[PDB]
Structure formats: C-alpha cells, structure tokens
Amino acid sequence: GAAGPSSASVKEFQNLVDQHITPFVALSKKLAPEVGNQVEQLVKAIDAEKALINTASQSKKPSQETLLELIKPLNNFAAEVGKIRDSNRSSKFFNNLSAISESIGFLSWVVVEPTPGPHVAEMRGSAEFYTNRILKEFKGVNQDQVDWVSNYVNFLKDLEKYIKQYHTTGLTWNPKGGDAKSATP
Numbered sequence: 001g002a003a004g005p006s007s008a009s010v011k012e013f014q015n016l017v018d019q020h021i022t023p024f025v026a027l028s029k030k031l032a033p034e035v036g037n038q039v040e041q042l043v044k045a046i047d048a049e050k051a052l053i054n055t056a057s058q059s060k061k062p063s064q065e066t067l068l069e070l071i072k073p074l075n076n077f078a079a080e081v082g083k084i085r086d087s088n089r090s091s092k093f094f095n096n097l098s099a100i101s102e103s104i105g106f107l108s109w110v111v112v113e114p115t116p117g118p119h120v121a122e123m124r125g126s127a128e129f130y131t132n133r134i135l136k137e138f139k140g141v142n143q144d145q146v147d148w149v150s151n152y153v154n155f156l157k158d159l160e161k162y163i164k165q166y167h168t169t170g171l172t173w174n175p176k177g178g179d180a181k182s183a184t185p
Helices: 007-031 033-058 064-086 094-101 104-111 116-138 143-166
Strands: none
Touching: 007 033, 007 143, 033 064, 033 094, 033 104, 064 094, 064 104, 094 116, 094 143, 104 116, 104 143, 116 143
C-alpha cells in the first residue's frame, strides 16, 4: 500500500532539507554573494513546497484554478533563480548558478503526474551537466566546491526516493480533507 495523506511526508521532506539543504545554504553564502542570493530563492521555493505538501496532506485536491494560486509563489522564486543566473554569465560561479537554474524545474514535481519522480531525475540530469564541470575544476583542489555539488545532487537523489515513497504517482491529496483554498497563511 501507499502512505496516503500523512504528516510523515511532511516530516521526511524537512529531513531532506536539514540534511542536504542547510549545509548547502552555508556553503553557498561562503562561495559568493550571487550564489548565496540564488540559493536563498531556492530555499524559499523549497519551504513553499513543504507548505504545499502539508496542505495537500490535509486538503482535498483543489480545482485547477485554486491549484494555480497555491503554486504561484513557487513559480515566482523559480523565475528569480533563472534571472539571477542569466545576469551573471561573467561570474566565476556561473556553473554553480546554472547547476541550479537549469534544474529548477524539479520543483514542478508537485504537479507532474503520474511520473513526478522521473521528472526530478530528469532535472537532476540537467544540474549534473554543470555540476560535473564544477567537479572537473575543483575535485581535489577546493573541497567546498565539491561539497556544494554533493549536497545539491544528493538532495535531488534523496528527493526522488522520497517521492517514490510518499507521492509515487503525484502529490498526495486528502479526499476527506478540508479546503486547501483557506490554507495556513
């Protein structure tokens, strides 16, 4: 069987953030301002996504109209992520910014059906084109660059497992739930 709507999917998602994203954020600020700024937006998108998962675990699947308003914030941060990287082509951290910008679509797993897991993996494939450049340049020379790459890639790897487990064929909603519309602002 499946887990169904469950506080466990909310808890495990946060465990993924604590494990991979928190140190990622520290490394990011340590690397450079533009990288810290772009990851700061990713974090906001991620936190918004956690809230979406929590709402879905407690609410019935909303109308498509309502479901666009709930992810609008997500889309906005994703947008900022790309703008930052697009305007920093001369940055020595362009590969870092592109690992994220070119895989930001991973956030959209919450509305991809019935293959959200494969969607994140495809996106990870895109970040890796750039994280491989990072490793090629810093493997054995800058462990912080290596650890930055590792936190992100493993975050996406664990995210795919989390999905296969708690939202196999799509974000899990609650048929006997409440109204998502009047969410928890």
